Amino acid sequence: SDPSSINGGIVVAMTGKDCVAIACDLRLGSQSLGVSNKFEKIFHYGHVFLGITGLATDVTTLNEMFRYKTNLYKLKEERAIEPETFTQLVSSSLYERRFGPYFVGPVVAGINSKSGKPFIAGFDLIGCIDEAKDFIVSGTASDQLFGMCESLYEPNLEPEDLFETISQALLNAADRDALSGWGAVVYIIKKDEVVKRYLKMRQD
Amino acid sequence: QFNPYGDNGGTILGIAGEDFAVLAGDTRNITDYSINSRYEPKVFDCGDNIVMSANGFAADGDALVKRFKNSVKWYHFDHNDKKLSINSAARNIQHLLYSRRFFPYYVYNIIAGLDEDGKGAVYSFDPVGSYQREQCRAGGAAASLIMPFLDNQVNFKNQYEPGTNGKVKKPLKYLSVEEVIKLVRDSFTSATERHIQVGDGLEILIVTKDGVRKEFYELKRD
Amino acid sequence: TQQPIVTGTSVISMKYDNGVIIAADNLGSYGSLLRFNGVERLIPVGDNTVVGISGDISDMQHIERLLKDLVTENAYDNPLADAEEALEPSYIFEYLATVMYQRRSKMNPLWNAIIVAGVQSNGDQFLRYVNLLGVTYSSPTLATGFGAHMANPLLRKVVDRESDIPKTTVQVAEEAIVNAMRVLYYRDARSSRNFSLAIIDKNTGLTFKKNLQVENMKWDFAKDIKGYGTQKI
Amino acid sequence: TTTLAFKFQHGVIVAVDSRATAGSYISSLRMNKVIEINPYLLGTMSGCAADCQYWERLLAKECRLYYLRNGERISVSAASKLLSNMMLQYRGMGLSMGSMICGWDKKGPGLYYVDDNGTRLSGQMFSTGSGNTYAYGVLDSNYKWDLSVEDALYLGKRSILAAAHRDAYSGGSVNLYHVTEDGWIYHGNHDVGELFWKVKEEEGSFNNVIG
Amino acid sequence: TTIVGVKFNNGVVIAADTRSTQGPIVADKNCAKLHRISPKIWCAGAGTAADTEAVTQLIGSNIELHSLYTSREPRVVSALQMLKQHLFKYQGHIGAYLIVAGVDPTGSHLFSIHAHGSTDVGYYLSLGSGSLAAMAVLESHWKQDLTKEEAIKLASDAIQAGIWNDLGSGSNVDVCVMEIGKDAEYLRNYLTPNVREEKQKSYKFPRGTTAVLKESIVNICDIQEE
Amino acid sequence: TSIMAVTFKDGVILGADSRTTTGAYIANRVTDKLTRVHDKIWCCRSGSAADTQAIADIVQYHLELYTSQYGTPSTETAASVFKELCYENKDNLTAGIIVAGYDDKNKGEVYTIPLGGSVHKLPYAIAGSGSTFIYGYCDKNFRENMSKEETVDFIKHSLSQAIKWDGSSGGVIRMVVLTAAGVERLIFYPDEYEQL
Amino acid sequence: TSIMAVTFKDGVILGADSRTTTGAYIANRVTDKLTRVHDKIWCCRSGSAADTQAIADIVQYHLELYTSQYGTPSTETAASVFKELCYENKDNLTAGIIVAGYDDKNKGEVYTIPLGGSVHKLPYAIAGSGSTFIYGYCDKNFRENMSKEETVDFIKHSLSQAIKWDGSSGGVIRMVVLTAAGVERLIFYPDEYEQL
Amino acid sequence: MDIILGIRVQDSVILASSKAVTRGISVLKDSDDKTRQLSPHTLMSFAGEAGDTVQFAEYIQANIQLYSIREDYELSPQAVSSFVRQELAKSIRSRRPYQVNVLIGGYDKKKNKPELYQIDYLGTKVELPYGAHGYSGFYTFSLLDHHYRPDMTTEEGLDLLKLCVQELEKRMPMDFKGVIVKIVDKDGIRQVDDF
Amino acid sequence: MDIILGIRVQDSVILASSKAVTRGISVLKDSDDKTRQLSPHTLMSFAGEAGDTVQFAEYIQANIQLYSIREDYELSPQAVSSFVRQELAKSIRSRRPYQVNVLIGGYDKKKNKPELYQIDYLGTKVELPYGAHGYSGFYTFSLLDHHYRPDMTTEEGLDLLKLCVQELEKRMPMDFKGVIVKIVDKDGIRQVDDF
Ligand SMILES: *[B]([O])([O])[C]([C][C]([C])[C])[N]C(=O)[C]([C]C1=[C][C]=[C][C]=[C]1)[N]C(=O)C1=[C]N=[C][C]=N1
Ligand SMILES: *[B]([O])([O])[C]([C][C]([C])[C])[N]C(=O)[C]([C]C1=[C][C]=[C][C]=[C]1)[N]C(=O)C1=[C]N=[C][C]=N1
Ligand SMILES: *[B]([O])([O])[C]([C][C]([C])[C])[N]C(=O)[C]([C]C1=[C][C]=[C][C]=[C]1)[N]C(=O)C1=[C]N=[C][C]=N1
Ligand SMILES: *[B]([O])([O])[C]([C][C]([C])[C])[N]C(=O)[C]([C]C1=[C][C]=[C][C]=[C]1)[N]C(=O)C1=[C]N=[C][C]=N1
Ligand SMILES: [Cl-]
Ligand SMILES: [Cl-]
Ligand SMILES: [Mg+2]
Ligand SMILES: [Mg+2]
Ligand SMILES: [Mg+2]
Ligand SMILES: [Mg+2]
Fold first, then answer.
1. Is the dihedral of CA G161, G165, G169, G171 positive or negative?
2. Domain spanning A1-204: which superfamily?
3. Which fold has domain E1-226?
4. Fewest Cβ atoms nearer than 10 Å: which of A10, B143, D63, D96?
5. Using CA atoms in the order C138, C141, C142, C146, what is the torsion angle rounded to 10 degrees?
6. In this structure, how many other beta carbons lie within 10 angstroms of the beta carbon of residue H2?
7. Residues of chain D found within 8 Å of residue A139, distances taken between Cβ atoms
């Protein structure tokens, strides 16, 4: 019944030293039934990354919508959109449906191409921006993720250390959530290289 | 309409060592968005080297503990001052809880102590009386925040040995009391940050063959 | 199951170095009607305990009678009724707490919030709360209803933790309580200007003050406030 | 929850998962859903944990008293009926219990399904819980009376795995039991995470999953 | 949420805590509840977080265009009027509870605003779940003819009352001072009485602890030449 | 809320308490419920604060525009504009308003507009939750053609009792005097009116 | 319903209207709400007619039996018996009763028992739906140690206003005077009290 | 309606759909074909609320046929599935949403690959090797998880499909009156007349 | 449970009862015997709420068996049916009524006549030549009204019963997994093992 917990799923993002990381599970379900183990929730528009949890139809719809808008932005501005600007676009777009909202929990992650500054942000389903320094969490295991991130996280981690921290935060949170798991992906992001890693986890 | 139940918040944590056990819990008592007390004890020494905490609805928690303490007293009277073992106490508590199957004690309950072989023991209960022995258990408001952390840092879940790449697990080495207390404090400090009902103070009860010892630590008061 | 009819609002209290203070206004409200203006909601039990009650007044009067009968019963076959075997604050509280929890367990509660304030035999301060649910807790400051939201913050500025109790005098504590009662009169719509205050000290005993009034109120600034935004006249 | 049990040539297999949930939160990774009533009687658990534990442990009291009075072990049929009659006293009061009473007696191996409604069914094969449909799929296509003890243990183990994978409220680990005329025999706790990858490689199944 | 506003001799000051919640969970520990409508008109917001920001940006935008159209500095009464009419129109469904303050050619002003569209005038105001704890402090310590330094102290003391005693409020204290004939000073994190203590242990893992299946480079660059 | 408007020899006087409540919490203890819609046409507001403010603002706009075209409007005209809003939007409003004004031709006039949006011209009017407790007192003590000082005492005593018994009413007693001489604001504090 | 009991120098006087209603229909216009439970202990009844009659009958039985064993009961004792019934059966009752009586030792006493079953000893008391409209009037006009004639006028004027404004109240004003001299019944008709 | 299954094998997609239509307590028909050919190499099966199903299917069919004529070109199964998803995601926030779940089986002639898409009434799209709607998956996915290989022949796909139907016929309380099976491959769409 | 049929022919009574037992969405058993022998020449089939059915049936069985031992005499089908009706009429005004519908098929050895009684959970008794409970009659009574004669043989009764089951299997949405058929005559009770 609750749209935000029909399909299930989680997203988490973290800042490091001159880098950011964003990760998600791969599950898509119909309540108790597991339907897909390949439903990736992280998308990218140039160098800006967007993770979306919640109702799967709205996740798909919003990806297609932000692809639409970022492609026009680029044609007119003659440059790729930056994380700070994209974050405002996400907020604007969500609030325009204030009284008929998309049932989602978006998470933005990326590095400003000019300043080199790492950036992450989280939103509620209607556009409120949470611009955190440390980490952002979203999904059906958000309580679990808060507990993991708040204890495991420390600032200024190197890319290969940050990978381990965010991975362990996601994995153990997902293993205490019935509606999350069935695989996981982690993006490690630096100013001009991005690595994507699929994690091995329990498939129940 | 009269609602006979309420939520006084709070969070509790039990960890079983090799020859010891700990039962910790925050000292904050609340209703809705108000604080009732910054120091209201929640973990109790019930006698016979057993510690207990009933988290949830305070009135039902105080009543259950009071009854179990009473059950220990009468166990001595009836069976020639025999020591109530932790397994026997656990089974006794199941029957205390199920006596109200149709008007339950609204509490998540944990007891800790030592088994008859001297090893550390933790038992966990649901409000209607289902129980089971465990190595690690967080209960109450911030239970969902803490348990995943304990799966990772106590049972080494999803942790493998470098170089093998997922082929060989991290071996399950035992934890010392000093190591356990670090995990307890970091658990409650993290829970305090993200959960509004957790804070003010942390009281830990440590159980060994020598007896029951207490430790208290301040937490954030916001 | 019932609904409260004639009600009493906040009861506030705090510990200080040599004892406890408790206070409550003299009003018995009938919904939004401020019906009864001479209601005493602090009820002394012996010379070492004061029970402050908020909520349903008919249930309060019932509790008042239980306590009166408790004193009578304690004196029976008790040569030390006025000495070693006198009623303690802890005895009185636990009795009430037993009654409140039993009544909630029969789905027929006493619709009240109670604070038992007193001093024990050994000179220790006693301050504990109990309500219709049988919920109990203790703290250096305690308050019911609106007092919990407005009085506690003010009183916790004086005694924020246990170590502040010996540093707090009876003059400072009474000043804080009286200020809190004024604030409740400003902001609680079911409060009255008239109130009662009781001090239980381990040296000077029980001092019961009646017919107190909220004074030194600030209202003058109201003359300068005009309209709700744009209006100048 | 997924539990199953089936009779065969060499007795009865009993397999269960170990997951416990409180809403979408996984409260327990390792819940024991079997009860050892006596050396020749087992009981599975599905539904409310409190109800399952209390009433099946109370059944064990009543089955033990039977032995003392009669100097003889209770039948599986009689044990299952005592339990169903307990459920019939709290008729409509809201108990949630689904259990299979598995054992060996003078008639040979015995298997009875019992639930909170008071239903009591004899049969060769049963499966209860939120993941029973997934387990039945594997069982129905691979079951034979002529099964070996080794293959039968695997079938029950593999059937739970199927359910643990698909059903969100099933998982954790697999507990196996084998009931003979000399009593039940515990065949260990098997983590699903490790078991899944093992079965995938050896069997070739779960091709759609990547590993 | 605890937000306050206090008038003084030559201006007005507003303050707020920095906690955001969903149920018993804290979403943001360092949230910014102080909003700029115009350079010398700021408002503090309680209630639904997206609504306080959105309604504040919209009116701020229209105030800026109005200022350009009229060749005048914006007035607090204008922002007040535009906010209340907007909120009234949405019959409380836009959950924005605001304390609006500022200085303009008319003088210094302090107003409150509720979600249904009712406005109130005062020398001291408080809104949010911790408004009762804050108002208790204000009613105890406020006086006429406060100085700038006394008013900041009163305002932050009122926020602290909310932080400590209200579970819906916490973390830090933000302040904004608007004095006549001066630039408005926005004091982000004026107080920081809730820094987390050092953890007992480091949870940095050995490299290679997490099991991996696949690795791949992600192409973020555009289509290349040649 | 306790509000009233009383006509007398030299004109009309409006009176009100200053309490605004959210349940039992007093959201504002120094509220101004006496509102100006024209130079010498004022109103007393009861019910929803948002609704009554929105209405009064619209009325003030209508009468400002009326004045620009047709000159000073009558008190009856002002009451009609209030009525039109309260009647046509009765399903979505909760507003009990008393309209009072002074002409030189018609002198002091009072119109009360309860929930339904009906209009009633009276010598005096009382409204708000606290008015229930003073129907008896006001009926027994009101006289026509009272002096300014007598009328001030009548309102002071009446609202004093309404405040005493009604929890939704309290604070200071605000008053506004409307005569040929001009517009005078009065205020009376608790220490003054409680001892009556 | 409009009922009241007022103590004065020589004793106590009870007063009541005579209207019983089923919605807006007046089922009885000459009801006697002033009820005798003992020679000089009477009560005023408001709320359910069935409940208040059943209670008063039980009380009269208790006080008759009390008298046979222990002699004349006090007014406080009578109020306690009322309370015990109203409090212990609060879930199933709707009864607002005022108890009034005359002793030689204690003189005139008045106890009011509202819905909850609480007891309140007062110099005077008012109750019933119509009492709301005369809280202001009664508070302003009541004095202690009034004469019989002054007290009769006070009750007459008070209930006159309560009747005027309350639809559930009306008919005749019944009164019962309790003094050392004895028990006197009074009645005042509409033509008399309406012109006040 | 009730049951719709789909399985993508090596060189084809196989769709199986129940034949029953029930009104009130009576089964009106036991030979109903719950499918529409969208294009020569794309087939869509459907299940949901009565009436809405056929009207949605025929509306999609008309749009794809219109596209085919306009461009003289067959849309890829992926393009068709995206169009269908958008129509359902549009529909879910309408005054009265269309309560229809679909499976789209197509053979991409460009890539020479069979493709199976599962889309529910909310507009939730997923590409799968095998899929189902409603309760069908609860009974059948355990068999498919076990037996399915991506290199299976069409004949092996049909045998695994028979096993799925047999399991349904054993453990489902409802009688769905068997299934109509259709195969989609490089040569187009054909119906298996004996199953 | 679901389906129970009864038909009284010349010299016997034939009862047919479904074999299915469903819990949730899964069919747990397809060989369930929904009947109890009350006495050597009296058989009772039953259908209603889960659990209540068997417990009521076994309670009736015990009472009749007790009577048989006490009197060393078999009660007539009419007497048994009246006892059963009274227990149900008693039950319907209880705190928690037993939701059970029954058919009682018996051969009266005194009168040398077969007898079929239909009793619903309210205690509504009727003697009939053929009967059913629930929706079963909606599909079958039209066939029985047409084909039934009172001089039919047992073999003819079985053929007409097969026709009724075939009609149910065609038009009922639910799969009841066939029926167990039992015959009650002068020689006692026997089960038709092939149907
Ligand atoms: B299983 O899901 O039936 C399981 C079996 C039980 C013996 C542990 N039950 C539970 O997980 C239930 C929830 C539930 C989920 C799905 C179907 C039915 C029931 N939970 C509990 O019994 C429970 C008890 N205490 C704490 C947490 N959960
Ligand atoms: B405070 O509690 O009033 C605060 C002020 C806000 C401007 C930061 N409000 C919140 O924290 C609200 C509480 C709320 C919860 C649920 C519905 C409505 C309001 N929180 C949020 O708006 C919120 C919740 N989750 C993420 C982001 N924002
Ligand atoms: B008075 O009580 O009618 C008063 C008059 C208003 C114009 C200031 N109204 C209120 O206080 C109302 C509530 C109410 C109380 C009693 C009767 C009718 C209505 N309150 C509000 O409108 C209000 C309260 N808190 C915030 C915003 N608005
Ligand atoms: B009075 O209105 O309270 C009156 C007093 C009674 C003792 C004669 N009560 C009634 O008239 C009640 C209805 C009622 C009206 C207003 C407040 C409370 C109750 N009526 C009856 O009890 C009644 C009416 N018709 C027939 C029988 N009883
Ligand atoms: Cl206002
Ligand atoms: Cl009467
Ligand atoms: Mg706080
Ligand atoms: Mg699973
Ligand atoms: Mg009248
Ligand atoms: Mg019948």
1. positive
2. Aminohydrolase, N-terminal nucleophile (Ntn) domain (3.60.20.10)
3. Glutamine Phosphoribosylpyrophosphate, subunit 1, domain 1 (3.60.20)
4. D96
5. -150
6. 22
7. none
